Design a protein around this ligand. Sequence first.
Ligand code: HEM
Ligand code: HEM
Ligand code: HEM
Ligand code: HEM
Ligand code: HEM
Ligand code: HEM
Ligand code: HEM
Ligand code: HEM
Ligand code: HEM
Ligand code: HEM
Ligand code: SO3
Ligand code: SO3
Ligand code: CA
Ligand code: CA
Ligand code: Y1
Ligand code: Y1
Ligand code: Y1
Ligand code: Y1
Ligand code: Y1
Lengths: 471, 471
Amino acid sequence: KTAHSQGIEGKAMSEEWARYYPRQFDSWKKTKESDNITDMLKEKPALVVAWAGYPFSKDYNAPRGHYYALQDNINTLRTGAPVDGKTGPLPSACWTCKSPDVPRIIEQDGELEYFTGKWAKYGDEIVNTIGCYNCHDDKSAELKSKVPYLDRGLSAAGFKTFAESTHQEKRSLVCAQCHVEYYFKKTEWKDDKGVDKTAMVVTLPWSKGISTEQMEAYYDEINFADWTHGISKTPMLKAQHPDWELYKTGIHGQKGVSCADCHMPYTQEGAVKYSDHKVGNPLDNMDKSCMNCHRESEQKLKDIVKQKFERKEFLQDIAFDNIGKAHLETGKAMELGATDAELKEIRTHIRHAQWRADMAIAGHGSFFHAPEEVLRLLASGNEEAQKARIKLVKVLAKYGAIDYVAPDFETKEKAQKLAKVDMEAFIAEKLKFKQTLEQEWKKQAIAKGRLNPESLKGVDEKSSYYDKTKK
Amino acid sequence: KTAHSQGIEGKAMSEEWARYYPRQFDSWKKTKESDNITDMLKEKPALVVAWAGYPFSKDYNAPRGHYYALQDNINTLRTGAPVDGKTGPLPSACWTCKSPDVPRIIEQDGELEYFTGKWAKYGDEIVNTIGCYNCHDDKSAELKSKVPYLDRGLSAAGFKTFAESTHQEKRSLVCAQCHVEYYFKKTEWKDDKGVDKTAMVVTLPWSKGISTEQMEAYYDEINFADWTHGISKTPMLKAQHPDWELYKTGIHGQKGVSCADCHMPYTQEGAVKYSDHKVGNPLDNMDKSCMNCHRESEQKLKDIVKQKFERKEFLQDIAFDNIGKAHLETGKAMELGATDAELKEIRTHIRHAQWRADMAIAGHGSFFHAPEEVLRLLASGNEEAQKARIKLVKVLAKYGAIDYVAPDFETKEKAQKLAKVDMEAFIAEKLKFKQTLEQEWKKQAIAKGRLNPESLKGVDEKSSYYDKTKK
Ligand code: HEM
Ligand code: HEM
Ligand code: HEM
Ligand code: HEM
Ligand code: HEM
Ligand code: HEM
Ligand code: HEM
Ligand code: HEM
Ligand code: HEM
Ligand code: HEM
Ligand SMILES: O=S([O-])[O-]
Ligand SMILES: O=S([O-])[O-]
Ligand SMILES: [Ca+2]
Ligand SMILES: [Ca+2]
Ligand SMILES: [Y+2]
Ligand SMILES: [Y+2]
Ligand SMILES: [Y+2]
Ligand SMILES: [Y+2]
Ligand SMILES: [Y+2]
């Protein structure tokens, strides 16, 4: 039993847990150190063509420290510029994996109500970032999954629920509350007062299993599309950080090595063992993260990972180049008057190509977590994309355009022009929101006592569209 | 110093070494146990289209035990049906990696003379299979490379020579005398008696380095082709078992684990350590071959290898399907009258596609030795093949044939018809050779005392074209 056996008042605010766990609080806060913004649309402008007609063609950066998750949610152009709790492009579900205020609100209002409405609905309530309460019971301090969709997905794919799993299983599943692929399943429901509502509910596409191909069958069976492509009008699927599913999968996952083993390694101090809560890049910390199970140099091992990264880049760039070309060639065929029936098989190829390639690259550690599956997926994706292009040559031929050359998209600017993204307009609208409604959120939350301004230190210094310089 | 410090009379005949090393002799002979013939043209008839116009479109089986190497050389349809020492399709170099009689003849007649003439030249001389004298000095019993091309290649690629290497390096290099990619470099020379000769000399394509792409540049720079494709008339490159180069490469090679560690593991008996000379499949022997360095089950580890194999199959089948189609589409474009200039870029793509995919699959353990490089290569190959096909669609369009569908090649029979291989004729001609000149070889060698008929026990019971049933 703990020094807080009856619970913690203000549990959602990680700082409340500091009185019991100063060591874990101090390392947890250090993810403030991972403050770099890598604009992935800038590195990989092919992704803009890929995501044409979708919010990720606006703004898409690489992950940084958990210290930034809530602010990044607010900052991304993907969440747009709500003017109140009923406006803005995105639903309430976008909060789900960013805040210990999520379980707080779910446990107070119910899952369906939580998943009902606009992201802006909870702006002055969902104010704390990735916190102790996302992973830990506030009485026992035991690892807990705080989100019901995870057990739902687990069961569906035949795994044990969180409660049913081993401790070593749990040390990965806590991560898997967030670090998995999801879709929003539009859900009709009735409240306590009898009103008709519609919830958009986080759903793990795991009921045929956790492989890319099994999820592909899942989505195909239900004829699901995340968006209709802005250039090719293909019914598209978006992969988002299938980190756990692919880790599963890979030799370390197979061997039973948990996420926490590399990302939260132990420091022994006599009778007391302590987990590093500074979740970051394990290569920054190889003695503790790797060298319990690996003999031989840090350096050789860092070089082996670099080599994996470069193999992944190689196949990634190929796949997304042919994916991009295929979308563009398809838009061209459309302009020339080619029919839906004439393009249906092409579009199915593009949908599958991109599903597989996105599933490979959407988890930023997968190139390491499951290198062979990653390469196999990117190679499989590219093959679908190439089959699309061979068929496209013929369709273009049929309409007099066999010599058509898809435009280039080697810069983010050129790519966003093709995708018809008025980023400037979006940034302007965004800043206005940050300057007005965002500050009203943070002011109100601080007044209500839901937010401690200590947690805002350097959290809002950078985004893909500004950089004050300091974070 | 050894019990044979002055050398061994009849060193080429491994049985001569038995008086000193009964334990190693007994396990060495046990590779007679690996007697299965897997006709790879039957499993993978796409390889017939790939090798159209080349001997491997006749006969190509998977490796079996070293006990069979010399007889398989004699049996393969690739060596055809010489009627004497000046006939038959293939040169003397085909003996090089099959027999301890090779170093014997090189050391007696010189490298250039050895490499001068037809394979049939040495039929009654090269009569012992893979023997102690291929790897061991007959005075010290120390590991030795017996072939000068290996050090030549080693130096060229910047590695230490055999003599310069560590013992653990040597325990892989002994294998690398044979288990590497090679080409025959036509070489003009003058003998002792002043006559003009031409040697076809085994050359490691390693002077730009040992990567697939480095060898590709090697061959491109010299405008080298192994054959001109029988269907597409592409200048082709043949990969042959780049086992060492790819192992190099892979995590085990990187970590310094030698071929001998898995393939020739140790048995400790007090003061005495003994290497298993039965070179075979290490999964048959996992306690000794794997479980010194791996904790956890044999079974999980066997399952992990199976999974690698199936990923390799998946990308292999894709690549060789598009390679096959590309050759066929190219032959079709030729029939319609397309020009060399119109096909040059296509052909370059096909040459590179197949070079890379063949380099991936030509070493039968590479899917395990270097799984990530294997997948990356097959994915790279397929991409070249797909680029070829997109360009081909246009060339076919230009000649009225945009709707052309390449024939299928899903059986060896169908594939050999397309490749114009009269296998029946070849088999008939072969049997005649085995029934006459082959038996004269073996009779004469046994008379001269170069061959002990004990070594022929069950060695000639099977091939791709007969099976007496017993081996
Ligand atoms: C111990 C289990 C977890 C592991 C191993 C893990 C791993 C990581 C890593 C390595 C990063 C990037 C950090 C960096 O750039 O150095 C990251 C970022 C992120 N993680 Fe986790 N994580 C875990 C738990 C969670 C949970 C439970 C959630 C959801 C509540 C979550 C949501 C996020 C988000 C939203 C980001 C991006 C943050 C940003 O860019 O601002 N993670 N995680
Ligand atoms: C559409 C609603 C959502 C929005 C607008 C949103 C926003 C973001 C942003 C801005 C990032 C930082 C990197 C980037 O710029 O992309 C991020 C990363 C992340 N998000 Fe979300 N999020 C949404 C839904 C979700 C959900 C439902 C989950 C969990 C089931 C989740 C989990 C994560 C995780 C684990 C990362 C870090 C790993 C990575 O980025 O690859 N997010 N999200
Ligand atoms: C400041 C907030 C946090 C506090 C006060 C806290 C507290 C603790 C404590 C007391 C332990 C046990 C001792 C130890 O291993 O150090 C622990 C371990 C652990 N925590 Fe946290 N934690 C926090 C944040 C988080 C979050 C957000 C996650 C999930 C993403 C998480 C996941 C884990 C994991 C996986 C272990 C390993 C436990 C084991 O080995 O069984 N922690 N934490
Ligand atoms: C399912 C459990 C795991 C999760 C959720 C997880 C999460 C992640 C994330 C989000 C990243 C991207 C970091 C970034 O670029 O922002 C990453 C990378 C990485 N992870 Fe994991 N990881 C898990 C398991 C593991 C394990 C078991 C290991 C070691 C065996 C490991 C080691 C690494 C390494 C070496 C990288 C690349 C370095 C980096 O980019 O940070 N991870 N992981
Ligand atoms: C970020 C730190 C780590 C790095 C960079 C790393 C690196 C590697 C690499 C490159 C492999 C080869 C597998 C492949 O091709 O993907 C491997 C295998 C393996 N690693 Fe890790 N690893 C790390 C952490 C760990 C930890 C914490 C454990 C133990 C709990 C572990 C145990 C293993 C095991 C058991 C294998 C399978 C090979 C074997 O049986 O020894 N690793 N690791
Ligand atoms: C210790 C170093 C070596 C290793 C690890 C090795 C490995 C192997 C393996 C695993 C096989 C297939 C056996 C089976 O089917 O179970 C094989 C076959 C073969 N090896 Fe080696 N080998 C080595 C040395 C050599 C040498 C020095 C030569 C050349 C003189 C050679 C030439 C061959 C040939 C020609 C075959 C195919 C034989 C046939 O199908 O009849 N190997 N080797
Ligand atoms: C063109 C001349 C040659 C011929 C006719 C020939 C014949 C054969 C045959 C019949 C096999 C058994 C498997 C099969 O049916 O393909 C084989 C395998 C093998 N040969 Fe050759 N050989 C030649 C040149 C070479 C050379 C020069 C080397 C060494 C530098 C070599 C090394 C090997 C090795 C290591 C294998 C077993 C590995 C594998 O087959 O993938 N061979 N060869
Ligand atoms: C019947 C013929 C052979 C005999 C009598 C023989 C003899 C021996 C002896 C006495 C040893 C040292 C003790 C031991 O480790 O068992 C040895 C080891 C070894 N032999 Fe052989 N050998 C034969 C065939 C071969 C062949 C054809 C190869 C090459 C393909 C080969 C490669 C090796 C290797 C790699 C070792 C390991 C030595 C070490 O660990 O340093 N042997 N052999
Ligand atoms: C360059 C050194 C090596 C050579 C020349 C070599 C040779 C080969 C050959 C020719 C095969 C194909 C067997 C067949 O299907 O006929 C093979 C497969 C295999 N080798 Fe190696 N090998 C080497 C290194 C290693 C090492 C270091 C390991 C273990 C770490 C290993 C383990 C295996 C395994 C598990 C297979 C697949 C099982 C099989 O098909 O026999 N090899 N090797
Ligand atoms: C045929 C028997 C063996 C099998 C089936 C096997 C299997 C594996 C596998 C699957 C990996 C993961 C790397 C990958 O993805 O390719 C690995 C890594 C590794 N193996 Fe092996 N292996 C064998 C023999 C050996 C031996 C004899 C040694 C030691 C001399 C060894 C030492 C290692 C090392 C050092 C790693 C790197 C991961 C680590 O650092 O632990 N293996 N092995
Ligand atoms: O948008 S979040 O799922 O990465
Ligand atoms: O023909 S031999 O090089 O496998
Ligand atoms: Ca999704
Ligand atoms: Ca070659
Ligand atoms: Y308190
Ligand atoms: Y990062
Ligand atoms: Y004797
Ligand atoms: Y075999
Ligand atoms: Y691997």
